Amino acid sequence: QVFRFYWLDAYEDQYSQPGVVYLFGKVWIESADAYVSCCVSVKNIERTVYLLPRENRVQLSTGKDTGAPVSMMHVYQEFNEAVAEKYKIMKFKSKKVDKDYAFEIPDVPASSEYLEVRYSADSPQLPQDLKGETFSHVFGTNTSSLELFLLSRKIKGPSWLEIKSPQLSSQPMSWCKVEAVVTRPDQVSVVKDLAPPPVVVLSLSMKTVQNAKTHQNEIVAIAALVHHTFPLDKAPPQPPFQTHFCVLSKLNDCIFPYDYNEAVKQKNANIEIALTERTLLGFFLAKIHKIDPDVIVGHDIYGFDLEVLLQRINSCKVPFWSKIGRLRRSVMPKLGGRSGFAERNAACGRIICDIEISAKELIRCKSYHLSELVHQILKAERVVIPPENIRNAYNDSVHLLYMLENTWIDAKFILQIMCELNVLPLALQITNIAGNVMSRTLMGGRSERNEYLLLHAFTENNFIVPDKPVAAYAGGLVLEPKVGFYDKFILLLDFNSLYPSIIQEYNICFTTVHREADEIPELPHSDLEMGILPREIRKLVERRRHVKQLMKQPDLNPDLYLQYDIRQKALK
DNA sequence: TCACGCAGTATCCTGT
RNA sequence: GGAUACUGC
Ligand SMILES: Nc1nc2c(ncn2[C@H]2C[C@H](O)[C@@H](COP(=O)(O)OP(=O)(O)OP(=O)(O)O)O2)c(=O)[nH]1
Ligand SMILES: [Mg+2]
Ligand SMILES: [Mg+2]
């Protein structure tokens, strides 16, 4: 009955299904003695809000202070009588909680007795600035469902979760092989000290052509390399790909050179030749559904690959577009938006790895084009197929097979680059340290990681976190140099983790320094206890130090050494 | 729906 | 005065 599964990604739709979080991952099946994809739907993640009592009753901010002391009973009565009826809230459960607070909202004391209201997510949402007669502020009005789930259940990054008393599904809700429904969030718990399971990986490369009339890109070839046991905590497997599949479609005008049959017959049986782009897209979707990859990797996947894939699927009305993702949906996500959030939603439940973003984050190169990346990482030369020659290649079997093999080689290069940098294990480590979702980590950026790190740190220590938002100061000192040439030994003395060590030493934190809503605040007293930000910083620093010790091991492999270096950099 | 800070060097342009 | 780059920590 107890469902033990490893979770990799989480998807929520704030507008369609309120209070539902779709976790995806892997579960172990003895009948097949293997790992299969699973989708668990956590339901009824009730909204939680915190009301801050006033010190003296105020006549709806009209008569100002009245002098009547306020207790939690007064706040509960005010919420039950006025607010609930006004905002159409039917049923709710309220309690009292003593919580601390130190952030950028004035008049909020350090430690106060808040009233915690828990009510379903189907009801309307209270306004942020809602002020009554006994409470002066409301916190948590717009908190998301996924954030509430992760913070309440103390879930940090991919891990093993146990579910007590799972329930089946009345109708299918996902393209996975195993499904379960949790009627409460308290039924999910995290089990520590277990190894990560293998995860399938699919590296895909597309070759297209721009039809001038429509100025729209048309797909003519796709190649994919698939590994069914890619590890998340060990070195990449050699070779980096187990199986492969290639699909090639004739253009809307040109025809094969009356020898493609013999060419494919004599080459191999893994190449699928289709006549219309609709068939190509359908076969690709079916193959993706059958393989069921947890990680899909590519170059410019967010920018060009997935966007063109979805555009062509919409244009060709290819049935079952939702196969591209892991959740069965009827309306396609709107095409557009910043970065690739629309593309991410289209592939909900499947981690997407763009080697461009990871290369930008991890290493430094003059250009992040695929050719330059292959030159700098794999140390190999990649041939380039001119855009104007792909169309003309539909005149001989040899040229068409060469084009398909070029796509295959591009896919292999992408997979090799992914393996070299340890993109996946490093992403897992960073996600576990921070506590965000893996797809967010692999989409790039730094703000989300620290945001979730501090969110977890504060929630664990009984704090009320801020509400999500809806050369400004002096920096370092650069001494004036004595420019010239020096032919004698120059000794460079550098501080170790300067700013983190400053935060630790002087105890700089939200709960220590006394801010006032552009002057430098005074240093905190030395009689206090270490805050949250210092402690977290210390943890990170120690991690880095340990990695450095590993780097110091004598007689270590070069490549591994380099990997360690990268890790160090990341942590720093 | 997004996005780490600041200090510093190098190059180039200002019509209707 | 502005604009465009990318090094350093
Ligand atoms: N916000 C921010 N600050 C940085 C970054 N890189 C360096 N700094 C700042 C904060 C560091 O404490 C300070 C000192 O630079 P260093 O390169 O010597 O790093 P640090 O001393 O922290 O560690 P290390 O000497 O490499 O062991 O410069 C950065 O990428 N972002
Ligand atoms: Mg330093
Ligand atoms: Mg000036």
Please give the angle made by the CA atoms of A327, A332 and A336, to the nearest 5 degrees. Answer: 120
SS3 A560: helix
Per-residue flag: A144 CB under 7 A of strand B: no
Helix (H) or strand (E) holding A474: none
What's the gap in Å between A427 CA and the centre of ligand 1? 21
Q: Is A413 exposed, middle or buried (0-12, 13-18, 19+ CB in 10 A)?
A: buried
According to DSSP, the residues that pair with A222 across neighbouring strands are A206, A247
Helix A532-551 with A498-506: angle, nearest 10 deg? 140
Tell me the CA–C1' distance in angstroms for A535 and B6: 25
Count of CB atoms situated within 10 Å of the CB of A18: 17
What's the gap in Å between A477 CA and the centre of ligand 3? 22
Task: Give the closest residue (by CA) to ligand 1 atom 21.
Answer: A497
Per-residue flag: A338 CB under 7 A of strand B: yes
Task: Spell out the long-range contacts of A270-273 with Cβ–Cβ below 8 A and sequence spacing 24 or more.
Answer: A270/A244, A270/A245, A270/A246, A271/A246, A271/A247, A271/A404, A272/A245, A272/A246, A272/A247, A272/A248, A273/A247, A273/A248, A273/A249
DSSP codes joined into one string, A279-317: HHHHHHHHHHHHH--SEEEESSIIIIIHHHHHHHHHHHT
Question: How far apart are the C-alpha atoms of A479 and A161, rounded to whole Å?
Answer: 53
Tell me the CA–C1' distance in angstroms for A394 and B4: 49
- Tallying the residues shown for chain A, one arrives at 572
To test ligand 1's pocket by mutation, which of A447, A495, A568 has the most ligand atoms within 8 angstroms of CB?
A: A495
Q: Six-digit token pair at A96?
A: 């009292």
Distances (CA, A) of A50 to A68, A186, A208, A456: 22, 20, 54, 18
Q: Are the C-beta atoms of residues A208 and A403 closer than 8 Å to each other?
A: no
Question: How far apart are the C-alpha atoms of A361 and A333, rounded to whole Å?
Answer: 28
CA-based end-to-end distance of chain A: 43
Q: Are the C-beta atoms of residues A467 and A140 closer than 8 Å to each other?
A: yes
Nearest nt (C1') from A475 Cα: B6
Per-residue flag: A366 CB under 7 A of strand B: no
Nearest nt (C1') from A498 Cα: C9
In which residue are the tokens 């040229």 written?
Answer: A399
Q: Would you give the DSSP letter of residue A327?
A: B
Q: Would you give the DSSP letter of residue A244?
A: E
Question: How far apart are the C-alpha atoms of A125 and A87, rounded to whole Å?
Answer: 8
Task: Give the closest residue (by CA) to ligand 1 atom 31.
Answer: A572
Tell me the CA–C1' distance in angstroms for A490 and B6: 27
CB contact set of A115 (below 8 Å; sequence gap of 6+): A50, A51, A53, A72, A75, A76, A79, A94, A95, A96, A97, A135
Please give the angle made by the CA atoms of A335, A341 and A344, to the nearest 5 degrees. Answer: 95
Largest separation between any pair of C-alpha atoms in chain A: 95
Task: Give the closest residue (by CA) to ligand 1 atom 25.
Answer: A496
What's the gap in Å between A493 CA and the centre of ligand 2? 9
DSSP codes joined into one string, A77-110: HHIIIIIHHHTT----EEEEEEEE--SS-TT--S
> What class, spelled out in words, does domain A199-450 have in CATH?
alpha beta
Backbone CA torsion sign across A458, A460, A466, A471: positive
Q: Would you give the DSSP letter of residue A269?
A: S
Tell me the CA–C1' distance in angstroms for A472 and B13: 28
Q: Which CATH architecture has domain A47-153?
A: 2-Layer Sandwich (3.30)
Question: How far apart are the C-alpha atoms of A538 and A122, rounded to whole Å?
Answer: 42
Atom of ligand 1 lying closest to residue A498 CA: 12
Task: Give the closest residue (by CA) to ligand 1 atom 3.
Answer: A499
Helix (H) or strand (E) holding A435: none
- Strand B bases near protein CB (under 7 Å) are 1-8
- Give the type of residue at A462: N
Q: Are the C-beta atoms of residues A102 and A132 closer than 8 Å to each other?
A: no
Question: How far apart are the C-alpha atoms of A390 and A410, rounded to whole Å?
Answer: 15
Tell me the CA–C1' distance in angstroms for A551 and B10: 37
Question: How far apart are the C-alpha atoms of A539 and A457, rounded to whole Å?
Answer: 12
Nearest to A243 by CA among A407, A378, A398, A412: A412
Pairing mode, if any, of strands A271-274 and A295-298? unpaired
Tell me the CA–C1' distance in angstroms for A472 and B15: 37
Backbone CA torsion sign across A340, A202, A415, A383: negative
- Give the type of residue at A371: S
Nearest to A40 by CA among A154, A182, A138: A182
Q: HSE of A536 in the Cβ direction (CA atoms, 13 Å)?
A: 21
In which residue are the tokens 């146990």 written?
Answer: A162
What's the gap in Å between A466 CA and the centre of ligand 1? 27
Q: Is A315 exposed, middle or buried (0-12, 13-18, 19+ CB in 10 A)?
A: middle
Q: Are the C-beta atoms of residues A559 and A419 closer than 8 Å to each other?
A: no
Nearest to A156 by CA among A452, A425, A536, A465: A452
Q: What is the Cα A193 distance to its own chain's centre?
A: 23
Q: Are the C-beta atoms of residues A366 and A329 closer than 8 Å to each other?
A: no
Q: Are the C-beta atoms of residues A153 and A188 closer than 8 Å to each other?
A: yes
Question: How far apart are the C-alpha atoms of A400 and A423, rounded to whole Å?
Answer: 33
Q: Six-digit token pair at A453?
A: 């790190």
To test ligand 1's pocket by mutation, which of A362, A478, A498, A567 has the most ligand atoms within 8 angstroms of CB?
A: A498
Protein residues whose CB sits closer than 6 Å to any atom of ligand 1 = A 494-499, 572
- Give the type of residue at A85: E
Per-residue flag: A341 CB under 7 A of strand B: yes
Please give the angle made by the CA atoms of A155, A170 and A310, to the nearest 5 degrees. Answer: 70
Per-residue flag: A481 CB under 7 A of strand B: no
Give me the phi and psi of A416, to 5 degrees please: -65, -40
Which ligand ends up closest to the CA of A497?
A: 1
Q: HSE of A385 in the Cβ direction (CA atoms, 13 Å)?
A: 22
Tell me the CA–C1' distance in angstroms for A571 and C6: 23
- Give the type of residue at A242: Q
Q: Which experiment gave this structure?
A: cryo-EM
Distances (CA, A) of A117 to A46, A89, A112, A327: 10, 11, 16, 32
Question: How far apart are the C-alpha atoms of A438 and A441, rounded to whole Å?
Answer: 5
Q: Six-digit token pair at A49?
A: 């809000």
Q: Six-digit token pair at A65?
A: 């202070």
Nearest to A176 by CA among A264, A291, A308: A291
Which protein residues have Cβ within 7 A of any strand C atom? A 364, 475-476
Q: Six-digit token pair at A211?
A: 């039809």
Q: Six-digit token pair at A409?
A: 């080689």
Question: How far apart are the C-alpha atoms of A488 and A475, rounded to whole Å?
Answer: 32
Cis peptide before A239 (omega within 30 of 0): yes
Per-residue flag: A470 CB under 7 A of strand B: no
Q: What is the Cα A25 distance to its own chain's centre?
A: 14
According to DSSP, the residues that pair with A199 across neighbouring strands are A230
Distances (CA, A) of A315 to A283, A318, A529: 16, 8, 62
Please give the angle made by the CA atoms of A184, A137 and A128, to the nearest 5 degrees. Answer: 70
Question: How far apart are the C-alpha atoms of A563 and A468, rounded to whole Å?
Answer: 36
Nearest to A208 by CA among A305, A282, A337, A123: A305
Question: How far apart are the C-alpha atoms of A284 and A190, rounded to whole Å?
Answer: 36
What's the gap in Å between A497 CA and the centre of ligand 1? 7
- Give the type of residue at A571: L
Question: How far apart are the C-alpha atoms of A392 and A254, rounded to whole Å?
Answer: 9
